Design a protein around this ligand. Structure first.
Ligand SMILES: O=C(O)CCC(=O)C(=O)O
Ligand SMILES: [Fe+3]
Length: 257
């Protein structure tokens, strides 16, 4: 339905995020969920901690070690939506598997407000977008996300969420999601997430898509600049991000009238 897709894109452009229900069917959800659980339990994950406590555990670059996650990262429907929303051809940058849950003596805490762009070591960071796919039901209390609509159109912080003049006065929209729903959000959209205050883990994936012309651009933060699976040598500033490691979401056409 091209009309509903136009409306959806227009919402994305105006707000800086959009909710898309039922992007995965029930079987797909049950497949990706199992693989998410398997990876978290049997492979390496990374703790995102703060003084406040545990923000989350995640499997980094999950697509590199798991085909099943790569299929999700390049899912045809998700990819097609992303490209339509972005308005250009895209490449995959990374997929992560995200877990928020309460453990013994380790309570889940919120994800503090931020925007994603400044942590992206590539040239088109400012127009990147993220697909966050719910693999279980994520009501408010299980730590769904909140977005500040229009915040992607604000100028740069002079550093920085909620630092620009008037920004604190801007309304915020909390978006609970059913299993198999996703959101897309722009790299400049301010977003946060609640603590998981339930007994059921919050499980999802988050995939970052970038302009197909993206080039390497170090942030100067070692941890963000070091891209696994890109060869022995560090990457040079300006180096294009291409190939299997940063795949095009849509096969480029050889066939033309
Ligand atoms: O899942 C969360 O708690 C935060 C996710 C996030 O910041 C992102 O997907 O860019
Ligand atoms: Fe984020």
């Amino acid at each position: 339905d091209p009309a509903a897709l136009e409306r959806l894109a227009a919402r994305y452009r105006r707000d800086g995020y959009v909710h898309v229900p039922g992007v995965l069917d029930a079987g797909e959800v049950a497949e990706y969920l199992a693989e998410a659980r398997r990876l978290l339990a049997h492979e390496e994950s990374v703790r995102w901690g703060s003084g406040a406590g545990t923000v989350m555990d995640y499997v980094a670059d999950a697509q590199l070690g798991s085909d099943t996650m790569r299929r999700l990262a390049t899912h045809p429907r998700i990819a097609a939506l992303a490209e339509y929303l972005a308005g250009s051809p895209l490449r995959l940058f990374k997929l992560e598997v995200l877990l928020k849950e309460n453990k013994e003596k380790d309570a889940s805490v919120p994800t503090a407000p931020h925007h994603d762009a400044f942590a992206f070591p590539f040239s088109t960071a400012g127009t990147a977008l993220t697909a966050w796919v719910a693999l279980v039901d994520v009501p408010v209390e299980r730590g769904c996300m909140t977005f500040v609509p229009g915040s992607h159109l604000l100028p740069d912080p002079d550093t920085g969420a909620f630092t620009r003049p008037g920004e604190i006065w801007m309304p915020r929209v909390t978006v609970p999601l059913r299993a198999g729903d996703c959101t897309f959000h722009h790299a400049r959209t301010v977003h946060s997430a609640g603590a998981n205050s339930t007994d059921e883990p919050r499980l999802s994936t988050s995939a970052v898509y970038m302009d197909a012309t993206a080039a390497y651009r170090p942030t100067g933060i070692a941890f963000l600049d070091d891209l696994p699976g890109t060869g022995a040598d560090p990457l040079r500033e300006g180096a294009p991000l291409t190939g299997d490691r940063f795949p095009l979401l849509r096969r480029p056409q050889t066939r033309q009238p």
